[PDB]
Design a protein around this ligand. Structure first.
Ligand SMILES: Nc1ncnc2c1ncn2[C@@H]1O[C@H](COP(=O)(O)O)[C@@H](O)[C@H]1O
Length: 635
């Protein structure tokens, strides 16, 4: 059977693979972690002691290369990873915490805010745990946020320390020049031998000097060396009836201004011991590649859930996924969380390889099997026990495809920053943490409890993992809870039967075409991902119009040897074939579109940090062009 075959691979792994064998969670440690009165920092401490000698975290090895022509010295990555142990990481954490707690003039205290501007890394983990160690509130800033937004965040949270990576010092210094509250700027992920990083650092210190700031600019290495000669810091443990704030996770609802979702000491502890499948509540060996930012809930769960199981968390070299598959192939994780964008990258690799190897003497469906086998064992590392997709919808055909590549199920996990990570797993309500739910009719979008095969409406939730609200935004907080205490997800679902729900789309993505047919734009975007010719797609509509438009980023091979006209016909053809396969309505098919050779990225503000389309920014970028296309066509 399919499970039988997969279970045969795992038995081989545990017989043969000694890294895997050595990373099995310890029952005694898991027991201690799930102990009743344990608070967040005690959990961290227990894990670190319990797994002290094991590799905890890894990063790419690197070299420093001097170009004798330019004279410039740059950090260069090597194709391997280096690890540090639980003991070493915790030692580093304790050093930062001692430095902060025992500072002679201006020490940090429980409840102070600390702001962090980074990706995900050993240094990030060090700073984040040190906050936890002292009961400081972590504010992990989104790299994708505009400086104006960052300043808004800092104004609101009044942190006493700001920490930043070199690539982010430009935004960090503008925040500090603006008269915000941090007293120290701590640079991390910092290699002074790299000229570009050194220049960013020395610029940062000299601009703050020139401007007469009293901010102390320093390196994380220097903070650690200082704490190394200071007494041990106390471990923060709130009293039994207290649940102080521990973490703010900023998230942008249906339009991009950040609101800080409040995670209390208790809610943050669920990332170590809550029951998702990627949370630390299991005995699965956790060797994983962390490629999502610590500013997002999925990044934090990926780190803390792995640490909770005594596994090893490897950090991706880059935040834009440009090293993602090289990293996965080197790490060979025993688990992944996919976002759909990553499934896209796998599909594009497949299409490319298949097209390339499809020579005259080929047997094609045996070739398909061979390309997928190569993807599986080599591109993705061949050590997977489990796979999950989440954060955004995956179309049925791409799910079918990915399962064919992985040769195991691809679990669909639905959750949110506000509601919690688990909520729905493969269409099944997860209890715990869900306490109850209901569907509420949405008459103006055509979703009623009395709809056709299955009831439809907005999902409203109660769960143990729901946030209490957003930090200092109580009128915004008021709107996400109904009179009875239900969290309004803003998501449309269908109820197949009790506790079994199918995600449709966000309420705000449901559009009524003029003839009165509703379309779901994010869902249709997912469907057209299966076009072998489409690299990215943004689908756009107007309720004043009868049909959809799109902005399509073609693949490199789709582009090759074609002019604009030919490229459009080829895309249009592919679009029709995909629509047929997914049994789409005629009105669900983009009837024209813009060709865009510039990919949507984090850097140009069109992708989020977890590679989701940022709809408000895409509407602002292409909306005028698109409406003009509507007008030209109507003419
Ligand atoms: N498995 C999934 N399928 C479809 N959409 C999802 C899934 N998981 C999360 N989402 C979407 O992501 C939103 C939460 O985003 P975030 O707070 O960034 O995790 C949800 O309200 C959904 O719109």
């Amino acid at each position: 059977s399919p499970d039988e075959r997969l279970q045969r691979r795992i038995a081989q792994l545990f017989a043969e693979d000694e890294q895997v064998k050595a990373a099995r969670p310890l029952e005694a440690v898991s027991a201690a972690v799930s102990a009743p009165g344990m608070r967040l920092a005690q959990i961290a401490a227990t894990v670190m002691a319990g797994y002290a000698d094991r590799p905890a975290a890894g990063q790419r090895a690197f070299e420093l290369n001097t170009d004798d022509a330019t004279g410039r010295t740059s950090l260069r990555l090597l194709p391997r990873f280096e690890t540090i142990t639980y003991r070493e990481l915790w030692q580093r954490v304790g050093e930062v915490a001692a430095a902060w707690h025992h500072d002679p003039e201006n020490p940090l205290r429980a409840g102070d805010f600390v702001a962090l501007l980074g990706f995900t890394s050993i240094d990030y983990a060090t700073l984040d745990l040190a906050d936890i160690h002292l009961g400081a509130v972590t504010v992990p800033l989104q790299a994708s946020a505009a400086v104006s937004q960052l300043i808004a965040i800092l104004t609101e949270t009044s942190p006493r320390l700001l920490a930043s990576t070199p690539e982010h010092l430009d935004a960090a210094v503008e925040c500090l020049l603006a008269g915000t509250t941090p007293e120290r700027l701590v640079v991390f992920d910092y290699h002074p031998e790299d000229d570009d990083q050194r220049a960013a650092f020395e610029s940062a210190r000299r601009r703050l000097a020139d401007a007469g700031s009293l901010v102390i600019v320093e390196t994380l290495d220097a903070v650690r060396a200082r704490g190394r000669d200071l007494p041990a810091a106390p471990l923060f443990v709130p009293d039994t009836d207290d649940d102080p704030l521990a973490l703010l996770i900023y998230t942008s609802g249906s339009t991009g201004t950040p609101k800080g979702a409040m995670y209390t000491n208790r809610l943050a502890a669920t990332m170590w011991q809550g029951n998702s499948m990627l949370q630390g509540n299991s005995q699965r060996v956790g060797i994983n590649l962390n490629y999502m930012p610590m500013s997002h809930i999925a990044g934090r769960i990926s780190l803390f859930g792995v640490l909770a199981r005594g596994g090893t968390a490897y950090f991706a070299a880059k935040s834009d996924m440009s090293t993602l598959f090289e990293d996965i192939g080197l790490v060979r994780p025993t688990e992944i969380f996919f976002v759909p964008r990553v499934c896209d990258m796998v599909f594009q690799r497949y299409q490319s390889e298949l097209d390339r190897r499809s020579v005259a003497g080929a047997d094609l469906d045996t070739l398909d099997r061979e390309v997928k086998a190569d993807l599986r064992q080599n591109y993705l590392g061949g050590r997977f026990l489990v796979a999950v997709v989440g954060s955004a919808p995956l179309a049925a055909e791409m799910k079918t495809f990915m399962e064919s590549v992985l040769d195991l199920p691809l679990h669909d996990g639905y959750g949110s920053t506000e509601a919690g990570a688990s909520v729905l797993l493969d269409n099944q309500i997860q209890r715990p943490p869900v306490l109850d739910y209901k569907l509420v009719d949405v008459p103006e979008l055509g979703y009623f409890r009395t709809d056709r095969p299955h009831p439809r409406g907005e999902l409203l939730l109660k769960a143990e993992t729901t946030i209490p609200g957003y930090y200092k935004r109580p009128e915004v907080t008021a709107e996400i809870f109904d009179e009875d205490g239900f969290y309004k997800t803003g998501d449309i679902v269908a109820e197949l039967e009790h506790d079994r729900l199918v995600y449709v789309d966000r309420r705000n993505n449901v559009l009524k075409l003029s003839q009165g047919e509703f379309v779901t734009v994010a869902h249709l975007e997912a469907v057209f991902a299966s076009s072998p010719l489409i690299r990215q797609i943004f689908i756009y509509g107007s309720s004043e119009r009868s049909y959809l438009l799109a902005v399509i980023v073609p693949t490199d091979d789709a582009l090759r040897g074609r002019d604009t006209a030919t490229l459009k016909s080829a895309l249009a053809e592919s679009i029709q074939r995909i629509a047929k396969d997914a049994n789409l309505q005629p009105y669900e098919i983009p009837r024209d579109f813009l060709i865009e050779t510039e990919p949507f990225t984090i850097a140009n503000g069109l992708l989020s940090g977890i590679a989701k389309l940022l709809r408000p920014n895409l509407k602002e970028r292409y909306g005028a062009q698109l409406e003009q296309m509507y007008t030209d066509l109507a003419t």
